[model samples]
Target chain A: SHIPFDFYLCEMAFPRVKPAPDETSFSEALLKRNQDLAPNSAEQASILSLVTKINNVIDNLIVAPGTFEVQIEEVRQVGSYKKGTMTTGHNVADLVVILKILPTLEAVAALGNKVVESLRAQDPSEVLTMLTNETGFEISSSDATVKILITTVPPNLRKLDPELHLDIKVLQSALAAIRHARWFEENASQSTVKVLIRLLKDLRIRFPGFEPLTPWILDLLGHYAVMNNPTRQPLALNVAYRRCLQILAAGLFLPGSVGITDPCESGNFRVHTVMTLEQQDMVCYTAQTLVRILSHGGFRKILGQEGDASYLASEISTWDGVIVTPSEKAYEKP
Target chain B: IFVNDDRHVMAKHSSVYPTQEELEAVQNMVSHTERALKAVSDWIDEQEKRTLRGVMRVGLVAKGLLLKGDLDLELVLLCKEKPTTALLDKVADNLAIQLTTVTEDKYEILQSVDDAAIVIKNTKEPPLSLTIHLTSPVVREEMEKVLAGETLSVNDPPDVLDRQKCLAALASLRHAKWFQARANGLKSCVIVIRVLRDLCTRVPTWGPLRGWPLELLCEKSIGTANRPMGAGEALRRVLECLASGIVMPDGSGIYDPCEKEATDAIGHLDRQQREDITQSAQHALRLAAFGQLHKVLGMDPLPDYTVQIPPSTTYAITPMKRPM
Candidate 1:
């Protein structure tokens, strides 16, 4: 009879309490944790060397005789590595291979074959290539993996044929990658910004609630967290990290919120608009919980320093006087 | 193309890209410095093993902020017990002699009661500069406690009473750890430090504003902003902060985070010296804001837009003026 009554009643949640600061310790811990998150000098050297080798192969493919039917226009380094915000374990380097011809499945296939052939010709060739969708190939060797994204030149992007079964969004994103890379290298490529970006990326891996956030979203948010202020003065890492949570908790990704504008894109495209409504709510709710935990000296748990392996899960837990609870979705699942 | 603002259009120089090449050169210098530090660290380890007085931990104090001629390394000798003044002097002397012998008289040794320093000269490379410090287990323990936000015990033996030296050692270690913890702090600090060092060369009054003081100032000014600042923006902020008279006698001066008390980082400099530095900083700030920062750093001026000179009235004959 007691169990039957309990089945109908859910446990009442306690009100979340905020505590005073231990920001110094939290920041020190953050810095210490960031050490492991970033690639060391030796790792960086290897990554750079591999990127150079891959670039050389692509260069040869561009000018080499009988390489492909499509004319190779240029190769642009994009993504986190190009932005200098790459993390330690995520070692895939992104290269956008721009072709002079129209974006088509045939051209993409030919490009993949040419890259595979050129790599296979190496003396101690252990490289393998796998075609990804209709526009790219994932090239892997022992040392590193290079993702070659195929796209037509910017002017030819508009002429892509729907009959080719190519995703127009994929081609547009490929071209956008180049623009994103340029915008970052020119505007947001400060050393401090890169450090924060890497930390944010690491956070995405460690927090399942943050999984819906993409690399581009992280990049823009990281830049804003660092440099956006009344006086345009950059915030300290401790302050910036907190500000990031505060902004998200303030409904930055919610439907009514304007959110961050994609700096490299045209029109009024909001970076957070890419996420679903449910995802937006989850992110904002997660951030609210984090801010509360951070204020209550639960940064160690939040940052994965004191938590268990399942620390990345979006589960409820109590720390001191504060409780971190899961987000309650408004929409019902099927 | 239009005649406006007393300026003519000029082609942008390819020299804009050469700064990237200069950065490449700086990177090469950094790599060389790292190799040199590794070699020196090994040498110190060998000498520590031979002495048997204590174990040595060689740490780089400068990290990425190494200049062309200045490569600094700190060697902390962790002894089991407190060594007497006589023993300290003897150990230092022995290590200096060993260094002299090993380097084949290529080293210039400076010996003191508690510290020993050596500048090892090389034919083709920058000199390796090292400072050797002595620390005992008790002192190390107390310093660690202090860093952990604990107060030092009031009572102490004379041996462990050299709190200043212990704090200095702890500060060096903390500096190393600080740079190590922040991924981009070292690189950002490197640029700021290099710019300040260059400014010091141009302004003699700013000579005292190098090393730890300069580094602390730059770090404080930059804060821990999550974004990496551009070199130009970082430099401007540094100048702006300095121009605000943070180092002045009445201004809010920087305190050493390693010290418990409010210890002024630039206390060695007198009021006049601080004033001179601040004045120069203000001037530098103006120059930087005007895009003439090269002049402030004593570098050659960059190519600017061609200036349009107003036509002066020309007379056929010299105007006759009454002699006063």
Candidate 2:
């Protein structure tokens, strides 16, 4: 008897790995995944303390009143330091310099000229000496925000990589993860919000379609679906993803039409003016397509235990219109 | 009759509420200021559109308070644009131009501290001054996070004014909203404290106090007390908090919710000035406890013991600073 898709690893032949004593069900598996992905508290604390120590040490050294004045108003672990959601061990700390003199964006672009003045000068408070001497610090990237590399020191200016790069992105905006962290601090036990943000971040990594979407958009959507709505908040991880999917599916999640309320006094943070039509349509289309797949129980293959490379063939078979496979089977020929 | 509890005295004083005429006058003043602000906002909207195009929004809303003779109107210019050093400068430049524009009335740009504070003075006979508080909705939240005492620096641009005005507006809004809810007990307390600030102004060193710091201290002292009290007792607790330096036994003072400053509100004052404030506050507390309401209000001692407030004629705008 000729079987269809003979070369594929059929679900019947698939060896089931029995769940552990602790991870007995889907709920346990999801919670275990979240715990495994989260950065440990000890490391988070040390990294934070290290940045503070560096900022204080440098600020103590520099004493001048100019554009190049190294007045470190703060040094904080901004990204995922205290946040329970960050995975992949990404570490970032912001060294906030209090500007003695205000600069235009044009002037900030001209930072090199002042860097030379601040770094190469005979002044007792030369900015470059302190960074290069003990800290080995170098400029990483300078745009709306500046990143200082704590690890690498740059080559001399006469050498190429000339250590100069500035890109002017007129409409680009970055989410202050610190603000999100602050929001999370008050409400971190709302595990659903963190799980959903982690899920959204992972989805973007898996699919290129989620590109061009900012991280804050994902965060706000998570907040809107779970944290903001008291009744919709999920006790189980699976339920959280489903709640997020429902918001997307209903088409009630448009930026301008729906305001994503955040913790702050200014007002409701709306997507009305923040997103482009192209981004809006892509997000909407993806959500609608996902809604159909999810309602049909197709989420099992993607978000469930079936989310394995061995199950790839069987999964694509179910999502026919949504995904296409080639006619010529190399596995069959081999 | 000398009452140990000052709540009775506050209830009596608060009974003499603002008259319909006084409330009407403040409403008129607010409306007039709002119209002028709209003109300025509309002009900024036009200019910033030319400058920033689709990247920004300059929100125009006026929040005012009816206090004493001062009809304080704040043009809360809610700019939701992404804060950058460059964009801040552009916002300030545009605001400066718009604020300085003259049509029916002449408005002078008295002083502007780059990206932080802007003062506009009305040079008419009964001089009116309007202050523009540029802030974003995120700022107050940002400030709360800072006040939440996270060492991590906020992602707000380096503009000091955003944090300053955001906090100022938050405190006032919270105070105003709560005052609305607890008008019977709180109104008398607020009125008397304001009268205290005026008298403190008559004193040498203690005079330079912020309305916000005093309000915050008063609110902290009142903490969840559902019972009504005299304006005198409320004033006494507030003075005690300040005179004792609002210090946590560990030496950390009360952090300003509206600004990154002191609980004793001595960031501006030198040691001598602080001593003067401490002495003045203790003196007021003594007077208040003894039922010397007239002396606390800085009036000639009277047999009636009534705190006399002068008649309100013209409304003056007092340009305020961040809580020290």
Candidate 3:
């Protein structure tokens, strides 16, 4: 009747949980969610086709007379479209046109007229254009919308008109966009990194708190979450998603936070410094709440696997564990 | 001293990456464990050959996952013929005598029908213990069936208990093999298990969920994802699975792969135990989600300090301020 101590030990720890039969299904679901967020092949083809026509039109404006006093040096496609992180619902593209002359109001208006005239001349019924701001215009078709941003050549940046409210600093940001695009292409070119970026972008749209996260922020943050670790190896998408939430919840975007350093800019310019203190607070607080929910297996709701698009914000509004309570924000309300 | 720079107020918190000090601590423990294992290897070989002539093979199973104070090595002794109750008793008696003569340390012999395991406690600087499992030919045959994906058909009540023990040992061997094959999986799994074991020690309710089953859960939670997983993430996944009630009575339990007959690896846990584990997991998951995983793992908590937020200079920009 002498039982081995090992057997007794086993008896104590008996009734072990079975290994999950569908072990990899959750990971596959995450990947499938990512795939679902991506723009389909036909959507991609149509958008690219329209973007190419716009590029050609902008290029011809250099020689086309009645366009502008400023010389059009080059037009570079930037933002989510060119970066390969575009989602289906957000089918918009951004283009940065570097000018040989100063980015004056007259020059921007003239350039806008030329782009509209040139496009309307080709497909009069299908194409439409509208001036968005002093330095940008929106060209739209039924298939896609392209936002053209105008910035002076680097040497002419100092000559930008501050009187028109188009400060030299504004053009500097436009120039920075060009550099940001190049940096992203060089560093975050991996398909997995792009997939994560798309997911984060979708989150930004679905969750109001993530609205403070700019496209450039999403690109860098996605890269950091996937690639930056002790082993210096890329993490699986699901793990990287959790890391993203963890970093945000840890006050990565809070005021006086080190945040992510701008790789293209000089000095210690943190990318998150661009947001106001209120926006920063919203992002951090929202992430903190989502992280709590995610810990409770709310990934399905966050990933849009359940409920409508507004579920995250609506559900989180009623959450009890929320940081930055309404009473706290009420102090500054007046 | 007054500092006005924006960078001064920026909080530089720690990352999840294991520090050099942490890695070195693990390495030190590992080297000590290796030394302790080497010290006992020759003695165990001699005892097995001299006392048990029917011993066909003696191998170290569950090699990497060794804790500091409880350094238990599981050695499987495969014999040539079916082992009887008398054989187990005789071997236990012989080991008990040799253990006293070989070292002045304390030892105990645990025996059963057709099975025996000797636990030797070495009174050394860094204490080490050994648990030797003497398996019968029936166990070897069952192991072969498990490896070949064949069903086991044991009818005798006595042999059923024996088969259960054999399957448990074989499951451990399979886990070790699976862990070793993955790149950087072994070290990550080691750190994860250590943290889980510490959690169990701190929370008595979680004690019943320790050992091979815990290791198997870790392996399954991580699955066969191609990317390299960090220890922090691995631990979180395990917590996620548990928090989702994967081990509760009504939950989808883990099936023991070693058993041909459908068996819940954790079917022995009663309702109360399952509830306690699930609740503990949920609480731990919340802590980990907010960058407080160290707290759940029973590590030192980060020091509490109030953050001083500078008054905002810019006016609040509300939704109505912008042109629609």
lDDT of each: 0.57, 0.42, 0.58
Q: Better model by TM-score, 1 or 3?
A: 3
Which tens-of-lDDT digit does each residue in A1-334 have in candidate 3? 1010111112222344444233254467678888898888878877887788889998787667453565888889888887888988767888998887777777677777777787788987765656767557777777788888888776676555567635676677778888988998998888879999988988887787679888888999999888766446677787677668756654465443457888998876888878876676567556645555554455777787875645454342332332211101101221
| Per-residue C-alpha lDDT of model 1 across residues B59-95, encoded as one tens digit per residue | 4233444333444545555444543455455554455
Model 1 docking category: incorrect
What DockQ number belongs to candidate 3? Answer: 0.06
Native-referenced DockQ of model 2 = 0.00
Better of 1 and 2 by TM-score: 1
* Candidate number achieving the greatest TM-score relative to the actual structure: 3
Could you tell me which 10 consecutive residues in candidate 1 chain A have the lowest summed lDDT? A1-10
Looking at model 1, the pairs that clash are A190-B228, A191-B228, A192-B226, A192-B227, A192-B228, A193-B227, A193-B228, A236-B224, A237-B224
Off by over 4 Å in 2: A1-334, B1-29, B39-73, B82-106, B109-118, B137-187, B224-226, B239-252, B258-276, B304-324
Best by DockQ: 3
Q: Clashing residue pairs in candidate 2, if any?
A: A105-B86, A256-A272, A266-B137, B6-B230, B7-B229, B7-B230, B10-B230, B10-B231
Go through the candidates in order and give the clash count of each: 9, 8, 12
How many times do residue backbones clash in model 3? Answer: 12
